[PDB]
């Protein structure tokens, strides 16, 4: 579990790195401009209440729905819900279109995302005693350990004395003993007393490196999916390795081996598992079979916070014989969650956002350029205008400038056109 390192899809949250959380005071009322947020007071305060409902454990089989248009702070508020829940919490942003896979089933892909939303907080402090054995009999046992770069003799507690007698010991055996109720023995194992005659033996163990007394500090924050993806290999290259269509490395029997060891760490009290947040954009795209999986998922106490988002008003239920419902959510699951409405930003609110994103991205710009780009944030979507910051900075650097002006941003619209305008131009 120490070797297991967390691999996170940072490209999804890359557009929200400018947001630090949810800007609100002690009473609960949202601030005008805090934590990288502009406006959206009604929706900010609303989910600022749901974070408390999770903390108070009052979200008994409940979820959240973010109703609003494109670029209305939906995905942004979802990340704020995680950021406000605790430190190093799992946030899994998905889109209904991601479920629509070619090889894996509609929920074999929804399963790993649920595993990507449930984490594990580890806080294990162990006192290592590695090396050989040099027995002495006092009034309750003295053993001298020999390591690769050190030698130390220690007067063991009578608790260890009972544990060592159970697992046969002799002078010249490599051992791993722990003060925190730990007993492990390697009978006769020692590379020092190994002859070159026998090779197939493997009955000997090398002399442990460093010192005998070692203070092992384990502070690990990994999701359940990280445990599955690390135990699948028969690991640095794996962050860029996926070129295989089948993806048969993750099998149901491999997950059972993870579920049992995770349970063992909870029973010991070493590490407790912490459920996070599962965000589903394009919630209407989800099949009826997916919603019934979610209904079963929400009933489990281990389950994370299922936050959905739908840009549609009235939509046909996917997986049903054409049944129009609100946001495309079936009634069975619509009642299961509380709806939070996300309001569109007026031109005055849009330029306040631009200045925050430019400051984070590292793009210097004139006051007049912010006004021109905000005009595109109201005529077209908020995502399109925000995308104009990076090409205009290159166009300015090329012209020798650091400050981006109207002339530089005018070319950005000419070169990089939105999906709506690009279609109409072709006629």
């Amino acid at each position: 579990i120490s070797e297991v390192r967390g691999n996170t899809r940072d490209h999804r949250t890359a557009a929200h790195t400018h947001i630090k959380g949810l800007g609100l005071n002690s009473s609960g009322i949202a601030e005008k401009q805090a934590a990288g947020f502009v406006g959206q007071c009604a929706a900010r305060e609303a989910c600022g209440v749901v974070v408390d409902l999770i903390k108070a454990h009052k979200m008994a089989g409940r979820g959240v729905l973010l109703a609003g248009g494109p670029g209305t702070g939906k995905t942004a508020l979802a990340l704020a819900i995680s950021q406000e829940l605790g430190t190093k919490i799992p946030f899994c942003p998905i889109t209904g279109s991601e479920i629509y896979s070619t090889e894996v089933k509609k929920t074999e892909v929804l399963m790993e995302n649920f595993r990507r939303a449930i984490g594990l907080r580890v806080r294990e402090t162990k006192d290592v005693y590695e090396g050989e054995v040099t027995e002495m009999t006092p009034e309750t046992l003295l053993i001298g350990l020999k390591s690769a770069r050190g030698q130390k003799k220690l007067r063991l507690d009578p608790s260890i004395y009972e544990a060592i007698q159970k697992e046969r010991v002799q002078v010249g055996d490599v051992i791993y003993i722990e003060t925190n109720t730990g007993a492990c023995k390697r009978v006769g194992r020692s590379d020092a007393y190994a002859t070159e005659f026998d090779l197939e033996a493997e009955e000997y163990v090398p002399i442990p490196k460093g010192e005998v007394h070692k203070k092992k500090e384990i502070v690990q924050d990994v999701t359940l999916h990280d445990l599955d993806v690390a135990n699948a290999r028969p690991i640095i290259s794996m962050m860029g390795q996926l070129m295989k269509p089948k993806m048969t490395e993750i099998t149901d029997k491999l997950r059972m081996e993870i579920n049992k060891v995770v349970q063992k760490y909870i029973n010991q009290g070493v590490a407790e598992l912490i459920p996070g947040v599962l965000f589903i954009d394009e919630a209407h795209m989800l099949d009826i079979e997916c919603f019934t999986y979610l209904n079963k998922a929400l009933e489990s106490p281990i389950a994370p916070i299922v936050v959905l988002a739908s840009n549609r008003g009235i939509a046909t239920i996917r997986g049903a014989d054409d049944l129009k419902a609100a946001h495309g959510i079936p009634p069975d699951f619509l009642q299961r969650l509380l709806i939070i409405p996300t309001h569109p930003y007026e031109p005055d609110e849009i330029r306040r956002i631009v200045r925050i994103r430019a400051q984070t991205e590292g793009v210097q710009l004139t006051d007049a350029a912010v006004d021109r780009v905000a005009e595109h944030g109201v005529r077209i979507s908020l995502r399109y205008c925000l995308q104009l910051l990076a090409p205009a900075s290159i166009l300015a650097r090329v012209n020798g400038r650091t400050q981006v002006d109207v002339q530089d941003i005018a070319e950005a619209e000419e070169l990089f056109l939105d999906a709506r305008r690009s279609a109409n131009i072709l006629t």
């Binding site: 020092a192 007393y193 026998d198």
Partner: protein, 408 residues
């Protein structure tokens, strides 16, 4: 106990009692010539034959042949009867014997315990001029140094890889105490026989092997792994093949199929020194219908080099029984040893050696620190020698001679 051959380096004239060997000058001088015959290459693929009366140190002379060849050359004793086993083919029984004789020399890094001893299943404490430590005795380690006769105050070197304890000397009655810490890993030469490499790499024999199960029949698959690794080590220069010495006792008992294998194993350029030992004058060959001198086929007698041992004189017998008396930790009066050697004149040396251990217990019941003549005379009258026991049965069976002096 046996130090070596006990012969002069230049003149090759043996001393009456030297290097753990007593008497048999004629045989020991002949033994010294054989060793020189092999060294010069004069004798090539030729067996030795120690013929003579029973219990004339035949094993000891061959033990002397070993130590006088090299520092750590393998020597193994094999009785011809032991070959005919209920479980293990006499081929495997002979292959094990030959593999026990051929060794390999490899320089290895291993820790050696060097320091003075302070004696007590048990616990024996060791000491150096810099550090002191207590060590719990292993069951097999106790049996290992009791054969070495290790006493308190002795300076010893225990190689942990082999388990052999070597007496370097003593500090007080001399060699001084070692400086540093006991365990020191050095590049030491290890000489382990082919059969021992097989028994190390093969399945470990469980407790009470004679209670039930197959014998030490090493699998053909395991032996293959060793042979191929030894051959790879010869070419590399890692191992040096050293041909030891095989001692075969009760040779008259060997079948015609054994001698064909012995010559086949003797055919090799790295073959060991095969020493044969016959305690018989005239004996028939087994497997063959024809008779021969020592029970050897008509083809073997011409190839073999024969050496003869002679019967020990009362003065030669005098020290042998006293050496065995000290080894068994018994104290005898001068009259008792004179009587014990007088037994060794008509009856065997081995029978007289058995009367040593028996007389001690009768002397223990009398509560005496000196084993006397009346103590020895008891053992002779209680326990009978083979020739007297058969005489006792024959008379009890049928009274061959009557009171009148008439036979039948």
């Amino acid at each position: 106990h046996i130090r070596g051959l006990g012969v002069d380096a230049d003149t090759l004239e043996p001393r009456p009692s030297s290097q753990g060997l007593v008497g048999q000058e004629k045989a020991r001088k002949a033994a010294a010539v054989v060793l020189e015959m092999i060294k010069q290459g004069k004798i090539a693929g030729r067996a030795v034959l120690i013929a003579g009366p029973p219990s004339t140190g035949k094993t000891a002379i061959a033990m002397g042949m070993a130590q006088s060849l090299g520092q750590d050359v393998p020597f193994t004793t094999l009785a011809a009867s032991e070959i005919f086993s209920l479980e293990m083919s006499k081929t495997e029984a002979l292959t094990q014997a030959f593999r026990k004789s051929i060794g390999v020399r490899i320089k290895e890094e291993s820790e050696i315990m060097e320091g003075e001893v302070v004696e007590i299943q048990g616990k024996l404490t060791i000491k150096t001029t810099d550090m002191e430590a207590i060590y719990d005795m292993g069951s097999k380690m106790i049996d290992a140094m009791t054969k070495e006769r290790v006493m308190a105050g002795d300076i010893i070197s225990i190689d942990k890889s082999s388990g052999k304890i070597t007496k370097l000397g003593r500090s007080y009655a001399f060699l001084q105490c070692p400086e540093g810490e006991l365990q020191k890993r050095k590049e030491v030469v290890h000489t382990v026989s082919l059969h021992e490499i097989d028994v190390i790499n093969s399945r470990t024999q469980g407790f009470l092997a004679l209670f039930s199960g197959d014998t030490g029949e090493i699998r053909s698959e395991i032996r293959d792994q060793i042979n191929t690794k030894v051959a790879e080590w010869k070419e590399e220069g890692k191992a040096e093949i050293v041909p030891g010495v095989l001692f075969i006792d009760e040779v008259h008992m060997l079948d015609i199929e054994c001698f064909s294998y012995i010559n086949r194993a003797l055919e090799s350029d790295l073959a060991p020194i095969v020493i044969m030992a016959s305690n018989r004058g005239v004996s028939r060959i087994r497997g063959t219908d024809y008779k021969s001198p020592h029970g050897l086929p008509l083809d073997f007698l011409d190839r073999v080099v024969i050496i003869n041992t002679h019967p020990y004189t009362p003065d030669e017998l005098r020290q042998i029984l006293s050496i065995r008396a000290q080894e068994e930790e018994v104290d005898l009066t001068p009259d008792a040893l004179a009587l014990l050697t007088k037994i060794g004149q008509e009856a065997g040396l081995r029978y007289a050696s058995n009367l040593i251990t028996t007389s001690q217990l009768i002397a223990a019941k009398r509560r005496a620190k000196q084993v006397g003549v009346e103590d020895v005379q008891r053992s002779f009258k209680l326990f009978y020698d083979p020739a007297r026991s058969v005489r006792f049965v024959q008379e009890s069976e049928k009274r061959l001679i009557g009171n009148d002096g008439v036979v039948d």
